[PDB]
Amino acid sequence: PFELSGKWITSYIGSSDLEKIGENAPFQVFMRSIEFDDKESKVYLNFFSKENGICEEFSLIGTKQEGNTYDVNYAGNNKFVVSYASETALIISNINVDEEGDKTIMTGLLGKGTDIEDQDLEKFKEVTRENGIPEENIVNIIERDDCPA
Template sequence: MKVVLLSLVLVLVCAAQETPAGIDASQVKGEWRTIYVAADNKEKIVEGGPLRCLYRRIECTDGCEYLSLTFYVKLDGTCQLFHEVAKKQEGDVYFIEFAGTNVLQLIHASENMLVVYIENNDGEKITKITKGVAKGGSYTQEEFQKYEELNSERGIPRENIENAIETGKAPEDSRYPK
């Protein structure tokens, strides 16, 4: 009888615990600026690297089945504007083809800060990347500490964090105000 009672209590305790909700992609739509970018394979995200994407806008469409991403990448010395669409997969991750195959996940969101985690497979290697984006032009000290913590949890070294604002800027586009 004690085993049955203990089992019942355990089931009730487990049922009462809420599973943390994932980030609702519809809450992060709008204008964003890449502030920081980091990767375990830094050559992918340095100036001129194929995955140094400077985000400008994120839109959620079809009930957030798709994320529309607007960003710049400097290729062959020229900044190019891209509009790409990522399709939602099981587990609140998105899939996109860009410089290989990418699985993208929104891992942290607040009023000013959004962190996107990406695993890029270029056919030879999987690279872990984070993009730290903001509604404004910078992070507070607390936001930067949170960004560092999220990178550490994913095995991305602190020394691989690049300040995108200080190391290069995308051209301004009048459709995407500051």
């Protein structure tokens, strides 16, 4: 089988709205771990983001919802699915509705730490594309993640 829980670090993120992912933006997210607790219908997320250019750490809890889905409060309301899982990667698709009501679709490629497999990367690009997110709306997060391990 397939272990979904553990260390996951963000390699790349794509977004329908570039305001949500540049420097210091709420969805420029540097993942550190995700733990799925299906017994209690919960997911545990630990990650860094930057504000004011300095690392801040978050540990959040989402709730398992209908189908394959999870709801979590962060910079508005979020519904995400693990669209793809391999031994080496997860691709997450997330819809965020922010505090103004604006809706953003994002995708995120995660791995076990820095050395990306091209096969996982190609699947990320296809999922991103399928969600209507253009290639130039992809940020390389590996390059930007200087937060603590």
